[PDB]
Amino acid sequence: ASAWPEEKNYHQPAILNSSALRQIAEGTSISEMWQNDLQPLLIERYPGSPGSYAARQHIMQRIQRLQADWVLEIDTFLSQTPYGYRSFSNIISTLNPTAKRHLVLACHYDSKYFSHWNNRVFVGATDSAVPCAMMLELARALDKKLLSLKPDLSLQLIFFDGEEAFLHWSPQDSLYGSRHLAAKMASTPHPPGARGTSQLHGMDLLVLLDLIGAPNPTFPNFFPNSARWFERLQAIEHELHELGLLKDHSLEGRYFQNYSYGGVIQDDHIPFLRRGVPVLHLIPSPFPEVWHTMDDNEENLDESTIDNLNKILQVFVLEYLHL
Numbered sequence: 001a002s003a004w005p006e007e008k009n010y011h012q013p014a015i016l017n018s019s020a021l022r023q024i025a026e027g028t029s030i031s032e033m034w035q036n037d038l039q040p041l042l043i044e045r046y047p048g049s050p051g052s053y054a055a056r057q058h059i060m061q062r063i064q065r066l067q068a069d070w071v072l073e074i075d076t077f078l079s080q081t082p083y084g085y086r087s088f089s090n091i092i093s094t095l096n097p098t099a100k101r102h103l104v105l106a107c108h109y110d111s112k113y114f115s116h117w118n119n120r121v122f123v124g125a126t127d128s129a130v131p132c133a134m135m136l137e138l139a140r141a142l143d144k145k146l147l148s149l150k151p152d153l154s155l156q157l158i159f160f161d162g163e164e165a166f167l168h169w170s171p172q173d174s175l176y177g178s179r180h181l182a183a184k185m186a187s188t189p190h191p192p193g194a195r196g197t198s199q200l201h202g203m204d205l206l207v208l209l210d211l212i213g214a215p216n217p218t219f220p221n222f223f224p225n226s227a228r229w230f231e232r233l234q235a236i237e238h239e240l241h242e243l244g245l246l247k248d249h250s251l252e253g254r255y256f257q258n259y260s261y262g263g264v265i266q267d268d269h270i271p272f273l274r275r276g277v278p279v280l281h282l283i284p285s286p287f288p289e290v291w292h293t294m295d296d297n298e299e300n301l302d303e304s305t306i307d308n309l310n311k312i313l314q315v316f317v318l319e320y321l322h323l
């Protein structure tokens, strides 16, 4: 009876030296992400809307043009909602589908529904168009390294639909895509042919990005079973900082501080966490001041902070995958 699902407990990163860190810092382009990955998502895209379709096509197209062997799946399903039955579509992008273990990066691509107000439309820039764009830029920037995966461990990206409540949060009105996908993965044998292990056992760690893009974010270390990985983000941030590879950044104003948060934050990680999946929740506390406001737009995003976080996340992923 293989103990492979326990490998994630002992998994260690292969740390990048200074030369490699400089390479990663130089290999990501915040202006290219801004134009090519982010702006096309700064549109109204609540579930079922034309914008949802447009956002999904954009995410799929940006991944499809890459050299690495990404396998795209659209996970479409029905759920009851305050507005009756509706359809939702999660986007899953996977390298090495049969690999037993995957490091998983995720965010939600839907935008919260709001009737237009005084000619303003809610586009959820930090929530979560930026996280979507960061995942797309990571796939682009690391494409040559990821192509080499073509340690039975690889990478998966999930863009959840329906994270937002159609009204205000309630247990039944929110997390449509993640409640559905967590249940589906929990009941899907993995690897193919397995007798008693599921796709959830294969999830080494779920790194969920949400509400990223405002100035001065502070991310708390939420969970003890992923605290050692939170510490790696702190170390990566510290070293990139010391090497002069971050912009408009100080250690007093660092993003990953030494502090926990014992309360529960409702987000897409919940259905996974409650089924035993380790989660590294990259959501700031407090939330951006523009949270769920028409001001959560492009103008209020902090470019250098997003650039810095792209560098930190890309190093984290390469170190985890030993690339």
Ligand SMILES: [Zn+2]
Pocket: 112, 127, 164, 292
């Ligand atoms: Zn939101």
